[PDB]
Amino acid sequence: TLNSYKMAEIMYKILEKKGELTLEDILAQFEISVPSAYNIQRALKAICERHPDECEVQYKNRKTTFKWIK
After folding, report:
1. Can you tell me the distance from the alpha carbon of 70 to that of 63, in angstroms, rounded to the nearest whole number?
2. Are the C-beta atoms of 56 and 69 separated by less than 8 Å?
């Protein structure tokens, strides 16, 4: 059992470095399953919504994409 929120915090600072994140980036970083990555993505979305001046969730028909906008 892994804390999805703690994992998402790791991704959030990777977002700041990288500028942009998708589910594939979570999968590559952690080497985990798709369902697990979606749990982290859900927690990452919650973190981004706490900082709308820094992060932008670009939900589009292709895929959810996190963008650093600070």
Report:
1. 22
2. yes
Task: Please give the resolution of this entry in Å, rounded to 1 decimal.
Answer: 2.3
Give the CATH number for residue 63: 1.10.10.1470
Domain containing 28: what range? 1-70
Residue among 31, 32, 33, 29 at smallest CA distance from 66: 29
**Residue 58 is which amino acid?**
Q
Rounded Cα distance between 54 and 45, Å, is 12
- Overall number of domains in the chain: 1
**What are the structure tokens assigned to 45, written together?**
């979305």
The structure was resolved experimentally with X-ray
- Give the integer Cα–Cα distance in Å for 16 and 61: 24
